[PDB]
Scaffold this active site. Structure first.
Site, PDB file in Angstrom:
ATOM      1  N   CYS A  61      40.713  44.233  44.838  1.00 58.09           N
ATOM      2  CA  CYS A  61      41.638  43.783  43.802  1.00 58.09           C
ATOM      3  C   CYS A  61      43.082  44.178  44.076  1.00 58.09           C
ATOM      4  O   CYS A  61      43.989  43.627  43.443  1.00 58.09           O
ATOM      5  CB  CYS A  61      41.245  44.344  42.429  1.00 58.09           C
ATOM      6  SG  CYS A  61      39.467  44.538  42.144  1.00 58.09           S
ATOM      7  N   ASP A  93      36.957  50.397  39.303  1.00 56.65           N
ATOM      8  CA  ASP A  93      35.726  50.580  38.545  1.00 56.65           C
ATOM      9  C   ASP A  93      34.511  50.117  39.321  1.00 56.65           C
ATOM     10  O   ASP A  93      33.424  50.681  39.156  1.00 56.65           O
ATOM     11  CB  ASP A  93      35.816  49.821  37.225  1.00 56.65           C
ATOM     12  CG  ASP A  93      36.699  50.524  36.240  1.00 56.65           C
ATOM     13  OD1 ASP A  93      36.663  51.767  36.260  1.00 56.65           O
ATOM     14  OD2 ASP A  93      37.445  49.865  35.487  1.00 56.65           O
ATOM     15  N   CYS A 134      44.336  44.512  38.754  1.00 64.08           N
ATOM     16  CA  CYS A 134      43.088  45.253  38.522  1.00 64.08           C
ATOM     17  C   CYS A 134      43.060  45.802  37.103  1.00 64.08           C
ATOM     18  O   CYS A 134      44.117  46.087  36.515  1.00 64.08           O
ATOM     19  CB  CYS A 134      42.948  46.403  39.537  1.00 64.08           C
ATOM     20  SG  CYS A 134      41.411  47.395  39.459  1.00 64.08           S
ATOM     21  N   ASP A 135      41.835  45.971  36.582  1.00 64.71           N
ATOM     22  CA  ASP A 135      41.475  46.494  35.239  1.00 64.71           C
ATOM     23  C   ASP A 135      42.549  47.155  34.384  1.00 64.71           C
ATOM     24  O   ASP A 135      43.185  46.524  33.538  1.00 64.71           O
ATOM     25  CB  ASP A 135      40.368  47.552  35.347  1.00 64.71           C
ATOM     26  CG  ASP A 135      39.010  47.001  35.016  1.00 64.71           C
ATOM     27  OD1 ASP A 135      38.882  45.787  35.202  1.00 64.71           O
ATOM     28  OD2 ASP A 135      38.103  47.725  34.538  1.00 64.71           O
ATOM     29  N   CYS A 206      37.945  41.272  39.643  1.00 71.38           N
ATOM     30  CA  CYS A 206      36.583  40.748  39.523  1.00 71.38           C
ATOM     31  C   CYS A 206      36.560  39.367  38.861  1.00 71.38           C
ATOM     32  O   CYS A 206      37.307  39.103  37.913  1.00 71.38           O
ATOM     33  CB  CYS A 206      35.701  41.731  38.734  1.00 71.38           C
ATOM     34  SG  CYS A 206      35.436  43.371  39.547  1.00 71.38           S
ATOM     35  N   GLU A 458      32.848  53.979  31.377  1.00 70.18           N
ATOM     36  CA  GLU A 458      32.052  52.771  31.206  1.00 70.18           C
ATOM     37  C   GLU A 458      30.700  52.951  31.878  1.00 70.18           C
ATOM     38  O   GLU A 458      30.637  53.342  33.041  1.00 70.18           O
ATOM     39  CB  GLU A 458      32.755  51.573  31.831  1.00 70.18           C
ATOM     40  CG  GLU A 458      33.362  50.661  30.862  1.00 70.18           C
ATOM     41  CD  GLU A 458      33.594  49.308  31.461  1.00 70.18           C
ATOM     42  OE1 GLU A 458      32.945  48.371  30.991  1.00 70.18           O
ATOM     43  OE2 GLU A 458      34.413  49.185  32.386  1.00 70.18           O
ATOM     44  N   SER A 484      29.017  48.466  29.735  1.00 66.38           N
ATOM     45  CA  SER A 484      29.678  47.479  30.576  1.00 66.38           C
ATOM     46  C   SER A 484      29.183  46.066  30.266  1.00 66.38           C
ATOM     47  O   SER A 484      29.978  45.181  29.919  1.00 66.38           O
ATOM     48  CB  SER A 484      29.460  47.850  32.045  1.00 66.38           C
ATOM     49  OG  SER A 484      30.543  47.407  32.836  1.00 66.38           O
TER      50      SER A 484
HETATM   51  C1  LIG Z   1      37.934  43.382  35.456  1.00 68.48           C
HETATM   52  C2  LIG Z   1      36.802  43.483  35.665  1.00 68.48           C
HETATM   53  C3  LIG Z   1      35.334  43.652  35.960  1.00 68.48           C
HETATM   54  N1  LIG Z   1      34.529  44.516  35.125  1.00 68.48           N
HETATM   55  C4  LIG Z   1      33.817  45.330  36.008  1.00 68.48           C
HETATM   56  O1  LIG Z   1      33.915  45.294  37.206  1.00 68.48           O
HETATM   57  C5  LIG Z   1      32.897  46.255  35.270  1.00 68.48           C
HETATM   58  O2  LIG Z   1      32.671  47.262  36.220  1.00 68.48           O
HETATM   59  C6  LIG Z   1      31.622  45.407  34.990  1.00 68.48           C
HETATM   60  O3  LIG Z   1      30.531  45.781  35.488  1.00 68.48           O
HETATM   61  O4  LIG Z   1      31.632  44.339  34.297  1.00 68.48           O
HETATM   62  O5  LIG Z   1      33.420  46.804  34.050  1.00 68.48           O
HETATM   63  C7  LIG Z   1      33.753  45.745  33.107  1.00 68.48           C
HETATM   64  C8  LIG Z   1      33.500  45.826  31.719  1.00 68.48           C
HETATM   65  C9  LIG Z   1      33.813  44.816  30.811  1.00 68.48           C
HETATM   66  F1  LIG Z   1      33.600  44.901  29.450  1.00 68.48           F
HETATM   67  C10 LIG Z   1      34.376  43.678  31.343  1.00 68.48           C
HETATM   68  C11 LIG Z   1      34.580  43.655  32.713  1.00 68.48           C
HETATM   69  C12 LIG Z   1      34.317  44.618  33.652  1.00 68.48           C
HETATM   70  S1  FES Z   2      37.367  46.807  39.653  1.00 68.28           S
HETATM   71 FE1  FES Z   2      39.381  45.951  39.880  1.00 68.28          FE
HETATM   72  S2  FES Z   2      39.069  44.273  38.467  1.00 68.28           S
HETATM   73 FE2  FES Z   2      37.034  45.104  38.280  1.00 68.28          FE
HETATM   74 MG   LIG Z   3      35.658  47.562  34.687  1.00 69.93          MG
END
Ligand SMILES: C#CCN1C(=O)[C@](O)(C(=O)O)Oc2cc(F)ccc21
Ligand code: FES
Ligand SMILES: [Mg+2]
Ligand SMILES: C#CCN1C(=O)[C@](O)(C(=O)O)Oc2cc(F)ccc21
Ligand code: FES
Ligand SMILES: [Mg+2]
Lengths: 569, 569
Positions: A61, A93, A134-135, A206, A458, A484
Site C-alpha cells: 500500500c 495491518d 493506507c488504513d 487493500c 483489530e 475485522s
Molecule cells: C483498508 C483496508 C483493509 N482491511 C484490512 O486489511 C483488515 O486487516 C481486514 O482484514 O479487513 O482490517 C480491516 C477492517 C475493516 F473493518 C475494514 C477493512 C480492513
Molecule cells: S493494510 Fe494498508 S490498506 Fe489494509
Molecule cells: Mg485494517
C-alpha cells in the site's frame, strides 16, 4: 470549539506563513538554510507547500508513494510554488494482523497527525498536500490539516488491483482465508501457497470496501480530495496526473484562502457519513470521522451515526459484504458517479465547498453518471438494505455505546450464556480445544480496548475460528476492541466503557445471560443491576501491559472508542 | 528498570522477530504482502532490517539522507538480508529559531523515538539501521533502539562543510550573526546578504560543536555508531561507503545477538559524557543522554554529569567556544583519534562493547592517532579549562537543578536585582526600548520550560541582544527554557522546577537580589524563604498556551528538564 494548537500567521498574500521566515531580516539564518537547499531570492517570495507522503517499502500500500510525491512536487513547481517533500511513518495491518504488532496500528493514525502538524508548524509551510496510501494514514493526514487549518489537499495513493491466477481472483482476504481453508481440508498446502503468491499483485491499499477505501471515499465525499481521488487505482496513469494537478488546485485554495475548517463542516461530515452508509463502509469510519470532526473543533457522536444510518440505505454490492471491488467502481464512473446519484436522491448536501474551489454540486454536475446497466450500485427502489449497515448499541453492558455491522440478515435477537475471555489468545485456545462449548453462547473477548489491549487492536481470527467451527449463526461475539470481518451472526466492537476502565463488560462472568436486541439497540444482562454494582465495588483495574514507549503514552492519552480514541484532549 | 514496551520474539536464529510472520501458516496474509513487495520464498528466510532515515527536503541537514538510505539498503542486501526503508519526520532549528515554530523542536526527538519504535514493532523487523542528519533526530533514534532492544546501528548523516566566499569563512552562526551586525552598523545590507547566500553550502548538520556534532560524537563514543561516523562530512565519499558497510556489521550483531542494552551501559554512557566534556559539547547533551539512559532502563542524573565534568578537562579548540569545526577534526584523525587520546589518558572505559562487535579499545587500538602538531586537541598538560564546561547549579531558585556552560572566564560570582520577563518577546522589547535598564541585573526569562513554552524552546536572540547592547559581562541571564549561545557572562537554562510548575523561578519579582555562585553551585535569592513560601501560597498556574494537538500532548506527557524531558513515564 476554539482549537489552539499551532502558530498563527504573522490579506491576500499567498505566503501567509512562510513570510514569517522568508521576509524579516531577523530571520537571516532561516533564509541561509533555504538558499542552501536551493532557493533563489525569487523563490523566497513564493508559497511553500509541505508535501507529506507516507511511503515505506515493507507494504504494498505504501511502497509507490515516493514516486507519487515526486509528481506532486513537480506540479507544485509548475504552479509557481516551492514544494518541500517530507515523509512520515505508517504500519501495515495486513502484515501485523494476528500479532501483538497490531497493538501499534490504531495509534499510528494519531502519530501521523502529530508528525505532519509538527513539520508544518516548525517549517512555516503555507499549505499541505498529503499522500497516504493506507488504513490509519488517511485520517491521520486530515486531522493534521484540521489542527493547522492551512489550505490542504489529500491525494489518495489509490487502491490495489485484485490478484489473478488461472481465471480465479484474489485479494488480501483470500490470503487471510487460506490458512483456515487449509486446516479445514478445503484446500491443500499447494493451493494455499498459490493463494499467497497471487493475492496482492502490486501497489495499493487493500482492494475491497475496507478501511482504506471507506476512508478515501468518505474523505472525497467530505470535499478534501479531488474528484476521483478515492477510486483511481494506485497503479493507474491518471493517479500520477492527479498528483501533477494538485499544485494548481492548491494555488487556487491559497488565492481563495479556502481552509480545511471552511471545508470540513457538520454538513460535509454528514456527506462523508452518507457515503459510508451507502457503500457499506467499515465501522472504523466511526472512529476516524469522529477524530476528524474533533480536529476542526466540531462535535460528532455515536448518535449522529445512527441518525445518518437510519436515513441512508445500503446500496453497493461490494466486498466484504458484497461482490465487487474498488476497481469495479472505477470502471463504472468512480466515486463522483456514486456521489452524483446520492446527491440526485437528495441524500447529500451539494452546497459544501471542496478543494476544487467549487461546491460538491458544481463538481458533480458534469461528471459521467453511473454506467448504464451497472449492477454494483442498486437503485433506491431495490436496496441491499433499507437502512445503513452501521448500528449503535447501548444496553446494560455497553452504556456508553458500541458499534455493529448489521446486514438485516441475522434476525433481531440473540440470547445466550456469556463465555468470557481476557484476550484473543485464550479465546482461540478454548475454541480449538473445545468448539462445542461455544454453541449458543455470547463470546466476550475483553481487555482489548484502547487502554487494555493496549491500542484497541483489530482481531480477525475469532470470527474465522467461529465460522470454521460451524458456529457462525449459533453464537454471538462482543469486544471492547475491534473485530475485522463478519460472522453470519451478531458481532459487536467498541464496547464502552472498556473493560480496562471498569465498564460493565469487565464485570461479566461465565454463565451470565446476555441478550442482544437489535430493535431496541441494547446489549443487556440478566444479572441484576445491584449484583452488577456489587461486582463493580469489588473490581480492581488490572496492571497496564506496558510501562514505557509509545503504547504507554497512548494509554496515558487516549479517549474512549465512543470519543473516536482522540489523544490530544 | 525492567522496560516493558515492545513485543518479545516468538537461540541463534538470525530472524528472531520476522519469523513471527514469515514462518507460521497462520500468517499467510503477512507473507502475501511480502511477496507483493517483492520477496521470494527464499527471501522469507532472511533477516529483515528496518532502515529508518530522517530525510526531508526543507533542511540542508536532511535533504541528502534518501541517497544515504539507498546505500544502506544495498549494503543490507549485499550482506544476505532484506532491507525495508522507511522514513520519519524531523524539523530544522536553524529555520525555526526565533519563531514559535521552535516550540515544536525538542518534542520531535520523542516523536521520532515513537515513530521508529512503532514501525519496528508492527512490522516485526529483526534489526535497525537509522540515518539521522540533524539535532533532535540523533537521540530520537537511539531511544527507539533502546526501547526495542533489537540489534541496531546509527549512521550519522554527517556534518556540513563550512561556507567560503572570497577568502572568508561562514557557518549557520554567521547567518545568525548577520542581522545584529547589520543594525549595529558593523556591516551593510549587501554584506549581510552575502553572509546568507554563502553560510550553508550543501548537505549536513550545523558545522560547529553544536548539538548535532555533540550528539553524533557522544553516540559514537557510546559505541552505537561505527568508528568515524560522527566525523566524516556529510558530502564525503566515505560516508556512502560507511552506509554500504552497515549491513555487514549489523549481520555480525545479529549473529552475536549484541543488542543495544548490551552496548548502552553505565560505563558507555560515561564514555559518551567524557566526550561531551572533552570536546566542549552542547548542554543539550544533558537532556538527550538522560533520555537515552532511561530508554534502556538505566538512571542518569544531573549529579552524574557534574562528576564527569569535574573529572574531565575541556580540550578542544572548537566553535562555538573555540575556532575549529568538525571538518577539521576529520582532517586530523577524526573522532576515533580524539577518543584514542582520551582512552590513553585513562579517561574512558575501553572494555565496553560496540556495534563493531568489538570493544572500544579494540576499535581504537589500530586507528591513526591525532596528527602530529595539530593545535585543535590540547594536551592534558595545557587544557583550555581544567574541568568540564558543563556546570550544575541548585540554589534557592533552581532547587531541582539547572545547567550552565562555564568557561572559567566569567569569575565565580554575579549578584544583581532581578529583571523578570514572562517570555522571550517581552524581554527583547524591553531591551530594545531601554537597554541601560538591564545593566547589572539578573535577567529572568521564565515561562519557557517544557510545559510553559510550551516545548522548552531554544532562545538565541536574548544573548545576541545583550551582546549588541554592550551588556555581555554586565548582566546575567536565567531561564527555565534553553539558551542557544553564550554571553561573556553567566547564562543558565533548564531551571527546575519550571515556572509553569510553580518552581521558585515563577515566584521571582523585579528587584529581588539574585546571587549566582559558581563555586558553591547555587542560584540564590536574597528574598527570605518565608516570603518565598508566602508568594507560593498565593500563586496560581497560568493557563496552558495550547489545548489541542501535539504540543498539548507534550504538556500532558513531558517530565522536567532535570529528568531529560522524557515523555513515556
Ligand atoms: C483498508 C483496508 C483493509 N482491511 C484490512 O486489511 C483488515 O486487516 C481486514 O482484514 O479487513 O482490517 C480491516 C477492517 C475493516 F473493518 C475494514 C477493512 C480492513
Ligand atoms: S493494510 Fe494498508 S490498506 Fe489494509
Ligand atoms: Mg485494517
Ligand atoms: C546541531 C546544531 C546547531 N545548533 C543550532 O543550529 C542552534 O540553532 C544554534 O544556534 O547554535 O541551536 C544549538 C544549540 C546548542 F547548544 C548547540 C548547537 C545548536
Ligand atoms: S538545524 Fe539541523 S543540525 Fe542544526
Ligand atoms: Mg539547535
Amino acid at each position: 470549539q476554539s482549537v489552539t494548537a499551532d502558530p498563527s500567521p504573522p490579506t491576500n498574500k499567498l505566503n501567509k506563513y512562510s513570510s514569517r521566515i522568508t521576509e524579516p531580516k531577523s530571520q537571516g539564518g532561516s533564509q541561509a538554510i533555504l538558499h542552501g537547499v536551493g532557493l533563489s531570492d525569487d523563490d523566497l517570495l513564493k508559497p511553500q507547500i509541505g508535501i507529506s507522503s507516507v511511503w515505506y517499502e515493507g507494504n504494498t500500500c505504501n511502497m509507490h508513494l515516493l514516486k507519487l510525491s515526486e509528481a506532486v512536487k513537480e506540479g507544485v513547481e509548475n504552479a509557481g510554488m516551492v514544494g518541500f517533500r517530507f515523509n512520515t511513518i505508517g504500519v501495515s495491518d495486513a502484515i501485523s494482523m494476528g500479532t501483538r504488532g497490531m497493538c501499534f496500528s490504531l495509534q499510528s493514525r494519531d502519530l501521523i497527525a502529530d508528525s505532519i502538524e509538527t513539520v508544518m508548524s516548525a517549517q512555516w509551510y503555507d499549505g499541505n498536500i498529503s499522500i497516504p496510501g493506507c488504513d490509519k494514514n488517511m485520517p491521520g493526514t486530515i486531522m493534521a490539516m484540521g489542527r493547522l487549518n492551512r489550505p490542504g489537499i489529500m491525494v489518495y495513493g489509490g487502491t490495489i488491483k485484485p490478484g489473478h491466477f488461472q481465471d480465479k481472483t484474489y485479494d488480501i482476504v483470500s490470503a487471510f482465508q487460506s490458512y483456515g481453508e487449509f486446516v479445514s481440508g478445503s484446500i491443500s498446502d499447494e493451493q494455499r501457497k498459490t493463494v499467497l503468491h497471487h493475492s496482492c499483485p502490486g501497489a495499493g491499499a487493500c482492494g475491497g470496501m475496507y478501511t482504506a477505501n471507506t476512508m478515501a471515499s468518505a474523505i472525497e465525499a467530505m470535499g478534501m480530495s479531488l474528484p476521483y481521488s478515492s477510486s483511481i487505482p494506485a497503479e493507474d496513469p491518471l493517479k500520477l496526473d492527479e498528483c501533477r494537478l494538485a499544485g494548481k488546485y492548491l494555488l487556487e485554495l491559497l488565492k481563495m484562502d479556502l481552509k480545511p475548517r471552511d471545508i470540513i463542516t457538520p454538513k460535509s461530515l454528514r456527506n462523508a457519513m452518507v457515503s459510508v452508509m451507502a457503500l457499506g463502509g467499515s465501522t472504523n469510519a466511526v472512529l476516524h470521522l469522529i477524530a476528524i470532526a474533533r480536529s476542526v473543533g466540531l462535535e460528532l457522536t455515536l448518535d449522529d451515526f445512527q441518525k445518518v444510518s437510519d436515513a441512508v440505505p445500503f446500496l453497493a454490492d461490494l466486498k466484504p459484504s458484497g461482490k465487487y471491488v474498488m476497481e469495479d467502481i472505477h470502471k463504472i464512473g468512480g466515486t463522483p458517479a456514486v456521489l452524483r446519484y446520492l446527491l440526485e436522491l437528495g441524500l447529500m448536501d451539494g452546497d459544501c465547498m471542496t478543494v476544487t474551489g467549487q461546491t460538491l454540486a458544481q463538481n458533480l454536475e458534469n461528471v459521467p453518471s453511473l454506467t448504464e446497466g451497472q449492477e454494483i450500485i442498486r437503485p433506491l427502489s431495490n436496496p441491499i438494505k433499507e437502512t445503513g449497515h452501521i448500528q449503535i448499541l447501548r444496553g446494560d453492558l455497553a452504556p456508553d455505546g458500541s458499534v455493529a455491522k448489521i446486514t438485516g440478515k441475522e434476525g433481531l435477537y440473540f440470547s445466550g450464556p456469556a463465555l468470557v475471555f481476557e484476550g484473543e489468545e485464550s479465546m482461540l485456545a478454548a475454541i480449538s480445544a473445545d468448539p462445542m462449548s461455544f454453541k449458543g453462547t455470547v463470546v466476550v473477548i475483553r481487555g482489548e480496548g484502547p487502554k487494555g489491549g493496549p491500542g484497541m487492536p483489530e482481531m480477525l481470527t475469532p470470527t474465522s475460528a467461529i465460522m470454521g467451527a460451524g458456529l457462525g449463526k449459533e453464537c454471538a461475539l462482543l469486544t471492547d476492541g475491534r473485530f475485522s470481518g463478519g460472522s453470519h451472526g451478531f458481532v459487536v466492537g467498541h464496547i464502552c466503557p472498556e473493560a480496562q476502565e471498569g465498564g460493565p463488560i469487565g464485570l461479566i462472568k461465565n454463565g451470565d445471560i446476555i441478550t442482544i436486541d437489535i430493535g431496541a439497540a441494547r446489549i443487556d444482562t440478566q444479572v441484576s443491576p445491584e449484583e452488577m454494582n456489587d461486582r463493580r465495588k469489588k473490581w480492581t483495574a488490572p496492571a497496564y501491559k506496558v510501562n514505557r514507549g509509545v503504547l504507554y503514552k497512548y494509554i496515558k492519552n487516549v479517549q474512549s472508542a465512543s470519543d473516536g480514541c482522540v489523544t490530544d484532549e
